[PDB]
Amino acid sequence: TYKYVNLREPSMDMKSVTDRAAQTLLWTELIRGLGMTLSYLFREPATINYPFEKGPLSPRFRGEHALRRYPSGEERCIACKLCEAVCPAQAITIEAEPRADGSRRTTRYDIDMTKCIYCGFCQEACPVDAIVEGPNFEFSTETHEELLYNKEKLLNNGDKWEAEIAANIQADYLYR
C-alpha cells in the first residue's frame, strides 16, 4: 500500500490565484514560520543543570569496569579467561597461577580502556559476576596512560563502587 506525497494540482480560479499572489507578495507562509519560533521562545527549555543535575540512566548502563568480591572479601574472579576470549576488542589481558593457598586466581588482569568498546560482553560471559561494567561514566583523564587499567585499579574500582554495583545487579539479574 502506498500514498503520494506530492501529486496535486493548484486551483486556477481567481480566488485561488489571488490567494497565492498574496502569499507571494505578503510573505504569509514566512510569517507563519516566525510564529512557530516565537512559540518556542516562551516554552520552558529542556536543558538540565549539569553537573548539579544528571541525565537519567538505567541499571543496565554500561560504564567503567570493576572487579567484584564475595561478601567474605574473596575475589570472585577465578581466572577462567572467558571474558578475555569473548572480548571483541582484545582489550583484556590475563595471567594466572595457583595462589599461595592453592586458589585459582589471576596475577594479571588488565583492561586497556582505550581498546575497549564498552560492549558489556565480558560481564555477560563471566560465570561468577566478577567483572562488571559499573555505573560510573565520569573518569576522563589527562593522559593516555591513566586509561590502561591493571588489576589493582580494577579491584579498587570494585571496592569504590560496590554499593551501587550490587544494587544495580539486584535490579537487573532477573532479566539475565
Binding site: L41, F42, E44, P45
Partner: protein, 69 residues
C-alpha cells in the same frame, strides 16, 4: 525561562539610551539650558551671529529682551 533573557536586553537598552540622553543634557548645559540652535541655512546663521554680538558676552544663547531697549 524566557525572562532570563531580559537582563541582557536591559543592559543593551541602557547602553543605547545613554548616547541620546547624554547629547540632550550636554546641549542644555552648553546652551544656557535651552536647545542647541539649529542653523541649516545662511539666514539662521546670520541671526545666530547677530545674537552673539547683541549678547554682549559673545554667546549666541544669551538672550536680550525688552530690558535692553
Amino acid at each position: 525561562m524566557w525572562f532570563e533573557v531580559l537582563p541582557g536586553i536591559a543592559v543593551m537598552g541602557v547602553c543605547l539610551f545613554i548616547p541620546g540622553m547624554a547629547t540632550a543634557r550636554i546641549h542644555r548645559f552648553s546652551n544656557g539650558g535651552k536647545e542647541k540652535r539649529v542653523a541649516h541655512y545662511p539666514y539662521q546663521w546670520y541671526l545666530m551671529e547677530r545674537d552673539r554680538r547683541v549678547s554682549g558676552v559673545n554667546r549666541s544663547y544669551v538672550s536680550k529682551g525688552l530690558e535692553n531697549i
